[PDB]
Amino acid sequence: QVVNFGPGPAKLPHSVLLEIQKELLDYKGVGISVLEMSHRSSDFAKIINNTENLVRELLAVPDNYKVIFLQGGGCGQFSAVPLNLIGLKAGRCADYVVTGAWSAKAAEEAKKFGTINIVHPKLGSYTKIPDPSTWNLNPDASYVYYCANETVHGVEFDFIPDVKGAVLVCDMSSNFLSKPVDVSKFGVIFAGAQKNVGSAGVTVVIVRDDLLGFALRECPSVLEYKVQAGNSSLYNTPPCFSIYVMGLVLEWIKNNGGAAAMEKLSSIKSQTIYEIIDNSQGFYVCPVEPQNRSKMNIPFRIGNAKGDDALEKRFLDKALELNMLSLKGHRSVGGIRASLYNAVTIEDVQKLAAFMKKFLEMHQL
Amino acid sequence: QVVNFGPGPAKLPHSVLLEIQKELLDYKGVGISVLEMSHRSSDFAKIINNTENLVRELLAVPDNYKVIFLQGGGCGQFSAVPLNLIGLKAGRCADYVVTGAWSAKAAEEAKKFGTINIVHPKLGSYTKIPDPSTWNLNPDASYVYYCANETVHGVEFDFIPDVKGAVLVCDMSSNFLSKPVDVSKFGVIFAGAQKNVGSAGVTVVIVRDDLLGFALRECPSVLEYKVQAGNSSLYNTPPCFSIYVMGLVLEWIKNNGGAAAMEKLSSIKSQTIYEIIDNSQGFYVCPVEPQNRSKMNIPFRIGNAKGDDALEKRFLDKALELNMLSLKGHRSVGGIRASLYNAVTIEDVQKLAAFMKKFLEMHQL
Amino acid sequence: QVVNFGPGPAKLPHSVLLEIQKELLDYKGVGISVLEMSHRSSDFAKIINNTENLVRELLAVPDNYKVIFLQGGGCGQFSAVPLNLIGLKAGRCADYVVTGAWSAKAAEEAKKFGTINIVHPKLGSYTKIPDPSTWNLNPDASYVYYCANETVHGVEFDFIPDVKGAVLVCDMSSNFLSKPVDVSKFGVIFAGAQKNVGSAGVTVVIVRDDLLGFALRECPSVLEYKVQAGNSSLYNTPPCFSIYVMGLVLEWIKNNGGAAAMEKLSSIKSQTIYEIIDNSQGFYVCPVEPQNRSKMNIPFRIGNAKGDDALEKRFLDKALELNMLSLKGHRSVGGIRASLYNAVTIEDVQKLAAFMKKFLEMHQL
Amino acid sequence: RQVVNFGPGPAKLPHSVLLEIQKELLDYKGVGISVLEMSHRSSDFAKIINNTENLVRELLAVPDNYKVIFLQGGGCGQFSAVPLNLIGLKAGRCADYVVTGAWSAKAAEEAKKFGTINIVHPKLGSYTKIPDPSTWNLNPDASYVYYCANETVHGVEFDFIPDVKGAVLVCDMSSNFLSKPVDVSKFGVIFAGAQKNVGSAGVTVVIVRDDLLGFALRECPSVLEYKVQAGNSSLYNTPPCFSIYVMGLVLEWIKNNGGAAAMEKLSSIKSQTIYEIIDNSQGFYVCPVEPQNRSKMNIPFRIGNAKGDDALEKRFLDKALELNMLSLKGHRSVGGIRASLYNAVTIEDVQKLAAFMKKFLEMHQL
Numbered sequence A, B, C: 001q002v003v004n005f006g007p008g009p010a011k012l013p014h015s016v017l018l019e020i021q022k023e024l025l026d027y028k029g030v031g032i033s034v035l036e037m038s039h040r041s042s043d044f045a046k047i048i049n050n051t052e053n054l055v056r057e058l059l060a061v062p063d064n065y066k067v068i069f070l071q072g073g074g075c076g077q078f079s080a081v082p083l084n085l086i087g088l089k090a091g092r093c094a095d096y097v098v099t100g101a102w103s104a105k106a107a108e109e110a111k112k113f114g115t116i117n118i119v120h121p122k123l124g125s126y127t128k129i130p131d132p133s134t135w136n137l138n139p140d141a142s143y144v145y146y147c148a149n150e151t152v153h154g155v156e157f158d159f160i161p162d163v164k165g166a167v168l169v170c171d172m173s174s175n176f177l178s179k180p181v182d183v184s185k186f187g188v189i190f191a192g193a194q195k196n197v198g199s200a201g202v203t204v205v206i207v208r209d210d211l212l213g214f215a216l217r218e219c220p221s222v223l224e225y226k227v228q229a230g231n232s233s234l235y236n237t238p239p240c241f242s243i244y245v246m247g248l249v250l251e252w253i254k255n256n257g258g259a260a261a262m263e264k265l266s267s268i269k270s271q272t273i274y275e276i277i278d279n280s281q282g283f284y285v286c287p288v289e290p291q292n293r294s295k296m297n298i299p300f301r302i303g304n305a306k307g308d309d310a311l312e313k314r315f316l317d318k319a320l321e322l323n324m325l326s327l328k329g330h331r332s333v334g335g336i337r338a339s340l341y342n343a344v345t346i347e348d349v350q351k352l353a354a355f356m357k358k359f360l361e362m363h364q365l
Numbered sequence D: 001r002q003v004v005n006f007g008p009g010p011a012k013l014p015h016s017v018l019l020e021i022q023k024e025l026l027d028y029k030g031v032g033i034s035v036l037e038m039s040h041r042s043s044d045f046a047k048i049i050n051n052t053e054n055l056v057r058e059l060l061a062v063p064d065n066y067k068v069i070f071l072q073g074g075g076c077g078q079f080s081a082v083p084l085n086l087i088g089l090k091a092g093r094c095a096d097y098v099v100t101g102a103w104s105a106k107a108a109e110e111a112k113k114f115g116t117i118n119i120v121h122p123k124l125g126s127y128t129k130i131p132d133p134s135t136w137n138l139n140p141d142a143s144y145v146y147y148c149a150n151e152t153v154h155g156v157e158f159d160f161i162p163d164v165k166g167a168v169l170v171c172d173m174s175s176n177f178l179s180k181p182v183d184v185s186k187f188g189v190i191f192a193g194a195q196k197n198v199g200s201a202g203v204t205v206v207i208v209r210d211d212l213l214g215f216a217l218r219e220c221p222s223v224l225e226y227k228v229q230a231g232n233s234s235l236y237n238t239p240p241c242f243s244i245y246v247m248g249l250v251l252e253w254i255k256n257n258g259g260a261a262a263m264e265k266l267s268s269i270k271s272q273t274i275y276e277i278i279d280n281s282q283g284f285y286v287c288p289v290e291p292q293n294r295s296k297m298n299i300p301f302r303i304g305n306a307k308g309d310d311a312l313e314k315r316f317l318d319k320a321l322e323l324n325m326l327s328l329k330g331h332r333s334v335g336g337i338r339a340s341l342y343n344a345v346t347i348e349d350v351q352k353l354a355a356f357m358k359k360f361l362e363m364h365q366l
C-alpha cells in the first residue's frame, strides 16, 4: 500500500527486492550471500561484468569510454572530478554552470583544487536555466561542469549544451538512465545509484579513455579514474552488494524497455502532475519555468507562491495518512516535492494525482 | 553445509543473515526497505545512531572520540589519514611501520601527501614485528602509523606500541573487535567493516576530537574527519544498507559476549590450527614467529617451507569438495590461508582441523 | 490474480469497475440505478453529453463532425456505412481495402447495397499492407473503406492513406483512442466500444456533418446517421449503461494522459512482446511484416511458422494455470494472440513477458 | 425517503436483482472478471445467454418450433427488422398494420421504407379504443399483419389475440412482455425491448417461428437478419453481453415470483387500484381510454378536466417529486400524467401513488 516518493535513496522495483530477498542466503546455489562474496571470486566477477555490460547497452556507451564503479556518492565526485581533470590544462581553471543547489555545492567543492569560475550571473532564484549563448566560457578552462537534473529545485536540462569543444562533465544522479543519452559528447558522466538506478553505496562514472592520467598528486587512489579503470573497478574492495543490487535494477530497466521506455514513462508521470499544477488556479505553484521543468522532481507550493504553511502541513499529514511517503520538500525550499524516478509506477503517480485533485476541491475557495 | 573462510569480504553470522532477509521488504513495519530508506528519516536516524552506540559500548570508546562511518574502504583511509593528519606539524612528516603488504601499501600511498619515512629497516620477509626499540621515530613527525593485523602475512600486534607519546594511527581492518582495545591510547583507528564487523561499503573511523581541523585543502569533503563528524556521518548519502548490516553484526557480537568473548573465541580457533602446524613434523610450515602469529589469518605451506604445489593443489581441491571455500592464500604469497574471523564458529575450525589432520594422515611419509 | 488479455470484450480499468459497483444502486445520490434511469431524464443528459465531450476532447474532433452513439456493434456499421454513404455518388460504388478478416467481412457486407471493388490484388496472407500506390482507386466511388487495426491478423496502419480526395471511412474498433488521430482527414470513423473504450453494447460513430442525407431508403432509422445526429443519439432508447460505462473509461483515459499517453504505452507493451518473439530464435513466429505490426493485438505461433499444436496447448494451459485469460488465438487462425488494449497495464505485459521467457527457456531444443 | 420509480422505459428493476449485479460486478461467480469484461465466446457467458433463452422459453411456454434470439437496436430497430425479414414473404411486398397508438403508428410509417403498407381500419379520431376486428380490411396477399399489444403512451392494450384469417401475425409486446401468459403458437414474430419489463436497455428479445426465416431482403443488415442470428444463436457479432446477463436475472426473478401467471394477477391488482380512484374521482382525474382496452401497464390521465388543468397538473408532479415518486410526467407528445406499473413496481409502490392521489383529490376537488 505504501507509495514511496523518496528523493534519494528512492524506491526500488518490488520485483527486484523480491529476488534480493529470495537469494539473500544462497545466491543462485553458490551457498553464500553476496554480502559474504569475495570481490576476487569468479562469482562476483560475473556480477560486476554483468552490471558494466548493462550500463553500456542501456546508454549505448561507445567503446572508447571506461565504465567504473566507485565509492563516495555523488559528493564524492564533487572532489574526484577536479582531482582527475582540472590538471588537463595547466591553468587549473574550470567552468561550472550553477542551476541549483547540487551544481552550486559542486562548484564550491571545486575551489579546493583550482580556480573555478561560474559561467553566468547568480540567479535571484533557481527557477530557470541561464541561456547557453549568455555563457562566459573560459577557452583555457580544463573542463565545463553542469548538473543535468537539480533534485532540490526541479531544474532539468533537455539538451546537451554546446561548450565549444571543451570536455563536458555532467551530474546525472537525478536522471541517470531516465532517457537515452549521447555519451560521445561528454568527457565524464557520473551518477549516484541511490536515486534512479539502485541503492546507496556505489557511484557510476563513465570516463572517456583519453582523459585518464591527468590526476593531481593529491588524488586518492580509490578515487583516481586511471587507477580504478586500470583494475576494472577492483583496485580495492568495491561495494559488492550495491553493485549486485544495481545490476538487478538495470536488468529491470532492460525488461521494461530500456532508456527509450523510461523517457516515455517519465513524460506521462511528470505531465500528470504538471497538468494539475497548471490548472490549479494558483492553488499549486511550481516556480520553475515551463521549458526547464524537471521530469524527475516536481517542487511546488500550496496556496500561493510563498506557500501557506498550515495548508501544506495538512497536505503532508493526509499524505502520510494515505501512506504516501517522503513528499516533504527539501529543507532549503520547504513546501512539497514529488520525486518520480524509474521505479515510481504510473499507479503511484495516479494515486498522488487523485489526492492532489481532492485536496484542491476541499481547500480551494 | 558451507564453511566460508573468506579473507574479506568474509562470513556473516547466520543469525544476522536470517534477519536481513526477513525485513528486506518491510523493515520493522515501516512499509519500505532499508535499500529504499532515506538517510534523513527518523527511521534511519535510529539505525546509524544505534550503530555508533554499539561501537562506543563494545570497544569502550571514551567520550572525547568521534566515531564516524565513511566510504572508500580501508584503502580509502590510506589517503584520508594523510589528508587529515599529515599537516598536524608543519614538516609534513609521518612515521610508518611496514609489517606487511597492507602496511607497505599504506605508506606508499601516503607518499603523495608528504614526506614518509619507514621506521625500521626493510625485513627480507614479513615474518615478525621489528622490536620497537630499533624504531627510529622522528619526534617532529605528525603521526605514527601501523597495521595491527596483516591479512596476507599473518603478523599481529599482541600489544599497543610505545611511540613515546606521539599520536597513534592504527589499521585494525582485519582484527577490529576481535579483542578489547584501550581506545584512549590511540589517535585515529580505522577498519573496513567487510572482514570482521559487516559487509563491504562502509569504513569505521574513530578519531580523537582534538585532531579535527588539520585537514589539507585537497581533502575531499566526504573524507574529511571534521566535516563528517559535524554531520554525524550524514554530510552526504552514506552507505545506508552497509551501516544497517554492521549494526546487526554489532548486536550479534554483543549478545555473544562482547569483545572479551571475541578474543577468547579467537584464541581457541587459532590455537586449534597452530598446534596442528607445530606438530606436523614439517608437513605444514608457518614462517611467522610465534610471538607475532595472528589469531585472524593463518597462512601456511604444505610439504616444505617453500611449498609443494602438488600437495597444495590437492589440499584445496579436497577442501572445495568439502565445501570449505576461500582457503587459497593471497595471490601474491600463494599457499593456504585460513581466515578465522568472528563469525567463523568453533565448529567451523574443527572441520578445518579434522581435515588438516586426516590429510596429513594420507600424504605424510 | 487474473490478467485479462481479452480480444473484445476486453479488460476494464479496475478503478472504473469499482465506481460502477459503488453507485450501481444509487447513482450519485439521485436515488436510482443507471440501469433504471430514463434516457429522457436530465440526469442521463449529463451522462451522454459528458461522453460526447470526452470523445471530442480526447480525439480533438472538429466542430463540423457529428458524434453519435448507435447500437449494433461493429458489424452494425458494416451495414450502416453503405446504407448511409454508398449513395453519395450515383454509381453506388465503393472502394474497399482488405488487410484482414474484418475488412474482408465489411467488404462482403457492403455487397448487399451496391458495387464493391477491392482496391488491391487479393493477398495470399494478411501479413502486410498493400502499398497505397498499388491501389486501384475509382474516381467515382462513393467512399473508400479500410480497417485501421485487423484484430485477428495483427496488421495495423501507422499512417492515414491517401485516397485522392475521396471520403475516407475507417474501422478503428480495435485501436480507438490508442493513439492520436487526425479526424479532419476522415469522413466517417466508427468503433465498437467493447475493445478499447467501453463494454459491449454501444458503437461510437464520428461523421462529417456534410455526409448526412445520402441515406438509402432501406436504411433503418436507428442506424441512419442523419436521423440519429438530429436526435443527439436519442431517436430511440440508447444503450444507457453502455454509454455510462464508456463515459467512465474515457474519463480514465483522460486522467492517464489522453491519446498521447496511450500511444506511448502501446509501444512499450507491444515492443516488450515483439522483442521476445524476435529474439526467440524461431521459437515464437509472428508472420506480420514489422512495419505493419499491430500494437494492440499480437498473434503468433509456437514451435514453427505452421505451429506446434502440442506445444501451443501446454502454453495456453500453463497460462491459464497462472490466471492469464483469453490468450487463445482466434478460431480461424489458431495459435496464440495477446491483446494489449488500454486497460492492460505494463505490469500485466511484464507477467506475460516473464512467462513467455521461461516457457521458451524450458521447451526450446 | 426511498425513491418510487414509475419509469416508462427504461424502468424500475427489482432491488434484489440490483443487489446481485452489484455483488458480482467485479468477480462474477469466482470467474475472476466482470460480466463487462466477459468474452461473448467463453463458456462462462455461454451459460448466461443459454440460461436466458431457456427462461424465455419456460416462462412464455414457447414451442420448440420457435427461435429465440437477442438483437440490438431496441424496439425501433425491429420496426425495420420485421419488414426486412418478412415483407418479402409474399411477392406483393404488402403488409397490414393495426394502428392503435403512437408506437403502432411509428412502426407502420417505418415499414413504408420497405413496402406498401396499408392500415386495415379507418383512422381513429383518438387513441382511446381498439377498432373492432370485424371492421378490419385484411389483405389476403399481405406478407404479415402487425399490431401493438400495449401502447405505452396512450394506455390502450389488447386483451385478446386478433384473428387475422390465418395470416402471419407480428406483435410488439415491449411494454407488456411477460406481464401475462401468451399463446406463442398464434404468432409468427413477437419482439419486445427488454428495458421496460424484463431488464435493462440495450437488448431486444425476438421470438420467430422457424419457418419464417430466409425471406429477408438483400438490404437487411446481417445483425438484424433473423436467419443469420438464429443460426449463430444470437452470436453473429458481439451481443450486448451485460444486458443479456441483466435480463436473465430479471427473468429468474419473475420465475421465483410466480411466473407470467402471477404477473397478470399482480398487474390486475395494481392497475385496478388506480383505475378505481379515477372512476370514483367524479371527473377530477380523467382517463379517456375505454374500459375494455385499458392497459394494466400504463395508465395515462389528466387532472381537473378532459383537456387538463396545467396548474393542477404542475402541482401534482411537483408534490410527487418531493415525495420521491419519479417519472410520473406523461409522454411529451400527450402531456398530462402517466403511471407505469411494470412487473418490478411493487404493490406497496402503487399504494404510495394511490394514497397520494386520494390525498391530492381530497385537497383540490371542488
Ligand SMILES: Cc1ncc(COP(=O)(O)O)c(/C=N/[C@@H](COP(=O)(O)O)C(=O)O)c1O
Pocket: C007, C008, C072, C073, C074, C075, C076, C102, C149, C150, C151, C152, C171, C173, C174, C192, C195, C330, D041, D236, D237, D238, D239
Ligand atoms: C476490428 C473489429 N471490427 C468489428 C468487431 C466486431 O464488433 P461487433 O460487431 O460489435 O462484434 C471486432 C471485434 N473483434 C473480436 C470479434 O470476435 P468474434 O469473432 O466476434 O468472437 C475479436 O477479434 O475477437 C473487431 O475487432
